[PDB]
Amino acid sequence: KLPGEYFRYKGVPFPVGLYSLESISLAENTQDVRDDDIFIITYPKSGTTWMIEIICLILKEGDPSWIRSVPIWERAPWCETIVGAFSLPDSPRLMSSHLPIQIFTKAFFSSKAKVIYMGRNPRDVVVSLYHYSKIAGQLKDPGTPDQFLRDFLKGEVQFGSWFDHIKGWLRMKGKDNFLFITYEELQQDLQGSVERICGFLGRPLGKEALGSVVAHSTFSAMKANTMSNYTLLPPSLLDHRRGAFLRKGVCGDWKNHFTVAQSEAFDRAYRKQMRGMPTFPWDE
Ligand SMILES: Nc1ncnc2c1ncn2[C@@H]1O[C@H](COP(=O)(O)O)[C@@H](OP(=O)(O)O)[C@H]1O
Numbered sequence: 001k002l003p004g005e006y007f008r009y010k011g012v013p014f015p016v017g018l019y020s021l022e023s024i025s026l027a028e029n030t031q032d033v034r035d036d037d038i039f040i041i042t043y044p045k046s047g048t049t050w051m052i053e054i055i056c057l058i059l060k061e062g063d064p065s066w067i068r069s070v071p072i073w074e075r076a077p078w079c080e081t082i083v084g085a086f087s088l089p090d091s092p093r094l095m096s097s098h099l100p101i102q103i104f105t106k107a108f109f110s111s112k113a114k115v116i117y118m119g120r121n122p123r124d125v126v127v128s129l130y131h132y133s134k135i136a137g138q139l140k141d142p143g144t145p146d147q148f149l150r151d152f153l154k155g156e157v158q159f160g161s162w163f164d165h166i167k168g169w170l171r172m173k174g175k176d177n178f179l180f181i182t183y184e185e186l187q188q189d190l191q192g193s194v195e196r197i198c199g200f201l202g203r204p205l206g207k208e209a210l211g212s213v214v215a216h217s218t219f220s221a222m223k224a225n226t227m228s229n230y231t232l233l234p235p236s237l238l239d240h241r242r243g244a245f246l247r248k249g250v251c252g253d254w255k256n257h258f259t260v261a262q263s264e265a266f267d268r269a270y271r272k273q274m275r276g277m278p279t280f281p282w283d284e
């Protein structure tokens, strides 16, 4: 029953069918936030999945049992989707959200709940989102790469502007219950990143569990795990016949997608938007 259209909530674009004024509004206003609750927030296609699998492996201290038997989307449910983690009985609760800070669960700000925000090179996010839209049922066709790029720069896509998203959420940097990390940092030193996240969550791991979290967190291990690779999804929601959720899993694929002209227009957009921002791994 997916149209591949957008509706708006507080001025932000949401895919029809998987979201509704109610589901979003409920996520925004719920008072149900707990001190040991864990949230993973990202702009779509930045590697949410990667992070979800890593923390599921950490919570079970390295035992692959849980990630092998339960679908990735049921282990870290979305807060705003029609079937939200808030609209369910299931602690320690692990949840996911793509909502931009000005819409995310307000009760969070005065709580002790933890949040890991993950950022990825917007260019690579563009490519991942481009391909994914073709096989994702809730998303309309990208159109030409060039038109898709313009849409992305205008924030005419699910969850709005990538620039607004990351800039808003970085406003939390400094609070001890907020960790900011990037796809590039995980690609560069997965183990190093896993230890760092263990510290953040107050969940130390022996050399054994650690090696195990790293092993089952690898792209190849994950693409190979049925419960984790989205292949149990209805073809009407994700066309398996035509593509995979876990597409390439690398850094830099944007250079094979952007024409030089597109790459130069993007840098102009980026330069204006990120004027006072700090330097990110992907800033070359
Ligand atoms: N373990 C892993 N290692 C590297 N990339 C991973 C990964 N798990 C997921 N990804 C990548 O994260 C993107 C999906 O993001 P999200 O989960 O936020 O929607 C995909 O990028 P690509 O399309 O570039 O391959 C996917 O391959």
Ligand code: NA
Binding pocket: 004, 133, 134, 135, 136, 137, 138, 139, 140, 141
């Ligand atoms: Na689609």
